Design a protein around this ligand. Structure first.
Ligand SMILES: [Mg+2]
Ligand SMILES: [Mg+2]
Ligand SMILES: [Mg+2]
Ligand SMILES: [Mg+2]
Ligand SMILES: [Mg+2]
Ligand SMILES: [Mg+2]
Ligand SMILES: [Mg+2]
Ligand SMILES: [Mg+2]
Ligand SMILES: [Mg+2]
Ligand SMILES: [Mg+2]
Ligand SMILES: [Mg+2]
Ligand SMILES: [Mg+2]
Lengths: 50, 121, 118, 51, 52, 200
RNA sequence: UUGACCUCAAAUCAGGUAGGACUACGCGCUGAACUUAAGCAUAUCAAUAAGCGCAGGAAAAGAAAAUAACCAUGAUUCCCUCAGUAACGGCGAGUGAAGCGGGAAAAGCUCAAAUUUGAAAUCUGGCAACAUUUCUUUUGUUGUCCGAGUUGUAAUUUCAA
RNA sequence: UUGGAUAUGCCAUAUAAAGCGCUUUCGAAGAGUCGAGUUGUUUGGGAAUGCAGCUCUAAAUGGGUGGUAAAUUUCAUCUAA
RNA sequence: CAGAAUUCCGUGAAUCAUCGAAUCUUUGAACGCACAUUGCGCCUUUGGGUUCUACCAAAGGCAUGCCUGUUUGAGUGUCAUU
């Protein structure tokens, strides 16, 4: 709401950070299956639920 | 990489001075990293960070040994200097407390101890 | 033993202060957040550059637990300049940004160059 | 229902008996443990008789 | 004597045995004689010839 | 000595002396807290024979416990079951009121170990008990071989597990044919465990 | 007036201690109904599920206010047996132990009640010194003083005596 | 790492504490507990197996147990709180 | 992917193994009081800025029940001496 608590704001920062593509060299590692992730959250699609 | 055996030979004040120099240097490496930098300085950030840790460890080692010295042969010692086993082990009866016996029990063990014996066929 | 009030109150007694037989903590901790923790890095975005050369103000990434008092002292101790006002904001990424305006007797551009982020 | 030859049935299995079934798969293991304890005790109290 | 049962039988016991007895004030005063805080009872067994 | 006289006199609870003392002490007890510290045992002879000693680390606490049965704590006498379980009023707690006295004092003195307890008084509303407690952290206890055992962690809250004198009585712990139900659950397990051997 | 004693307070007093978690196994409290009885209420499911308290490496039990009725046995626990037996049961459905015997393992003891009374012989704490260490982290010894304690701390005894 | 061996080589523990042995007079032994009634619960426990409430409430060769209620008399065995 | 050959016949690589010294943010039984608040206080010492009382910073502290002990007390509870 723009009226928000500090605790809420900290969580929003973290949520935005986890909402990023993985760098390719992570998936290029020998023995890694990080090629695609089901954790790509979008604001209209899947809600944070605080 | 600073050598820790060389660090232990220095006084606490000189170590505190050396630490400030390392922190000032680490701040410079980070500023340069933001405004473009080669890979040697990037590897120098990690080395400088570990050098700061080495100095902090020596300073703390020296301080703790001084505290152990100040509290040698004292009944009550700082908590972080006492045993760190388990909570239950700290509360257990001491071997001395466990081995206490009444006079009646002491006499019994003195006069009727279990013997060594054998049966010959 | 004259009581002129119908209310008994607890009499005052000595209340000694603590005289421990041992310090609970052997070694006092060094100052947390002195000056190398308070100032994390200069910020050199385009908007920060305009703040430097138009309003004589520096932009710093600072520790979340720094306040306007400690940011002022840290800048004075680290870069030997005297801020006149400090404004602070917590960015949407969760990190703290400080707008450090310098006095009219110092040039922010020169300070920026001396730090080396220009 | 009851219609076959033989004894009227008596089986006491109306509680949750499968919860408390005791198997004996450790029977040779227990036997080995007990023998090893006897050997350990005999060497400790020697030359006293074990019994 | 605050739990009085500790001494409530003593006058009957003293009377039965024919030993003189007196009830006196302050277990605390009796204790002072024997270097203690209090004493429930004191007994005189022997007294020197000069105090007979 | 005096202890034999105190023991015999304690048996005469209907005598004029004991009736009077009981009345004044019960009145005095009702004036203080439900649980309160006793400076000394009100029954020194009874306390000694239950393990108490007049040394540092032994503590006496007094407590009053409401008398009578256990009303079933169900909302409006409603039990939601078969008529055999519809009882609300004339029910009884399986543990003695003395056991409850020990439980509550033990919680009140969570640094101590409950040793034993004894009756001291009663009116229509309350029974009064004195609970003997021992400090396992005190050096006078830890260096004493006769009470040392209680320091070991197996004796933690022995009153809560029915391990005091009154706790074992309420558990029906005893020898011989009258106590065949024994420790109930352990005995029950032995009789309800189907033993399936390797027949080879 | 002071002091003693008693009882009762207060302190960020000196030093300790409890709580929370783990619950397979362990000690208790509380406590159903589905179900079976070809219906159903006693019964059964079950002294079970759920609920609550409390432990340990095991727990609990334990050195007889025990068996027996013998030529007697001899703390406790566990196994096999006793035994689907004696017994309980709308004697319906169903339920159901124990002594002996064989075996695993074995271990025995402590107080309270006694006048040390030609000697509180007992204990904690502080301080100091001296030792000690899984360990500068551990554990004690002596001295001294103060407290505890005669409303009883030690010592000989615990019925087998 | 005295656990065992000559556990040697030696510390110096070791002077006053236990064993049996005749004779005596003795021999303190746990109380709102046991026990009784009654109510509830529980048990295979049957005119109550254990537990609990309430009422009554002990004794000194007494008291408990001896699986059919009671009164008496024996016997055996154990020794609670 | 590099980078680092200020090292590789070496107290020295390694997300190596092991591990007896340390560090160990905000919390949580969670302990100054709170908490949909990075909210509101108190104490000790040391520093800063004119400040022995305001303000700022740092270090160390401040929960509850209970136990042993200490100190300071309370009572027309019980006493002795003046
Ligand atoms: Mg703002
Ligand atoms: Mg036991
Ligand atoms: Mg049916
Ligand atoms: Mg049907
Ligand atoms: Mg139906
Ligand atoms: Mg359950
Ligand atoms: Mg454990
Ligand atoms: Mg045990
Ligand atoms: Mg015996
Ligand atoms: Mg059944
Ligand atoms: Mg007895
Ligand atoms: Mg029930």
């Amino acid at each position: 709401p723009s009226h928000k608590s500090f605790r809420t704001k900290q969580k929003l920062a973290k949520a935005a950070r986890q909402n990023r593509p993985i760098p390719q060299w992570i998936r290029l590692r020998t023995g890694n299956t990080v090629h695609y992730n089901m954790k790509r959250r979008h604001w209209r699609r899947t809600k944070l639920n605080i | 990489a600073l050598k820790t055996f060389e660090l232990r030979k220095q006084s606490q004040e000189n170590l505190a001075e050396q630490l400030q120099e390392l922190r000032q240097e680490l701040a410079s490496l980070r500023v340069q990293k933001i405004a473009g930098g080669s890979g040697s300085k990037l590897s120098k950030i990690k080395t400088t960070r570990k050098d700061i840790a080495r100095i902090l460890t020596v300073i703390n080692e020296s301080n703790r040994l001084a505290a152990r010295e100040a509290y040698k042969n004292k009944k009550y010692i700082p908590l972080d200097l006492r045993q760190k086993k388990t909570r239950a082990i700290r509360r257990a009866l001491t071997p001395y407390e466990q081995s206490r016996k009444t006079l009646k029990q002491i006499k019994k063990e003195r006069y009727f101890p279990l013997r060594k014996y054998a049966l010959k066929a | 033993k004259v009581r002129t009030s119908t209310t008994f109150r607890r009499p005052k007694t000595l209340q000694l202060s603590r005289k421990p037989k041992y310090a609970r903590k052997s070694v006092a901790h060094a100052p947390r957040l002195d000056e190398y923790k308070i100032i994390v890095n200069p910020i050199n975005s385009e908007s920060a550059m305009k703040k430097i050369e138009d309003d004589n103000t520096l932009v710093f990434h600072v520790h979340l637990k720094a306040n306007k008092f400690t940011i002022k002292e840290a800048v004075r101790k680290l870069y030997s300049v005297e801020p006149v006002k400090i404004n602070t904001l917590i960015r949407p990424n969760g990190t703290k940004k400080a707008f450090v305006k310098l006095s009219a007797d110092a040039d922010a551009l020169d300070v920026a160059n001396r730090i080396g982020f220009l | 229902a009851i219609h076959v030859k033989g004894q009227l049935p008596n089986a006491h299995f109306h509680k949750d008996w499968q919860r408390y079934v005791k198997t004996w798969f450790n029977q040779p293991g227990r036997k080995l443990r007990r023998r090893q304890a006897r050997q350990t005790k005999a060497a400790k109290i020697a030359p006293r008789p074990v019994e | 004597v605050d739990p009085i049962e500790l001494v409530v039988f003593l006058p009957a016991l003293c009377k039965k045995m024919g030993v003189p007895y007196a009830i006196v004030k302050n277990k605390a005063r009796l204790g002072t004689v024997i270097h203690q805080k209090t004493a429930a009872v004191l007994a005189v067994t022997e007294v020197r010839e000069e105090d007979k | 000595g005096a202890y034999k006289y105190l023991e015999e006199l304690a048996k005469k609870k209907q005598s004029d002396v004991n009736l009077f003392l009981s009345r004044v002490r019960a009145w005095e007890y009702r004036q203080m807290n439900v649980i309160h510290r006793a400076s000394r045992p009100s029954r020194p002879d009874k306390a000694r024979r239950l393990g108490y000693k007049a040394k540092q680390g032994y503590v006496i606490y007094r407590i009053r416990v409401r008398r009578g049965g256990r009303k079933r704590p169900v909302p409006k006498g409603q039990t939601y079951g078969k008529p055999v379980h519809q009882g609300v009023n004339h029910l009884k707690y399986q543990r003695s009121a003395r056991c409850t006295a020990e439980e509550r004092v033990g919680r009140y003195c969570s640094n101590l170990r409950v040793l034993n307890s004894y009756w001291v008084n009663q009116d229509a509303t309350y029974k009064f008990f004195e609970v003997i407690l021992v400090d396992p952290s005190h050096k006078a206890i830890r260096r004493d071989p006769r009470i040392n055992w209680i320091v070991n962690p197996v004796h933690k809250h022995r009153e809560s597990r029915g391990l005091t004198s009154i706790g074992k009585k309420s558990r029906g712990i005893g020898k011989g044919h009258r106590y065949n139900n024994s420790p109930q659950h352990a005995t029950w397990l032995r009789h309800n465990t189907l033993s399936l051997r390797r027949y080879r």
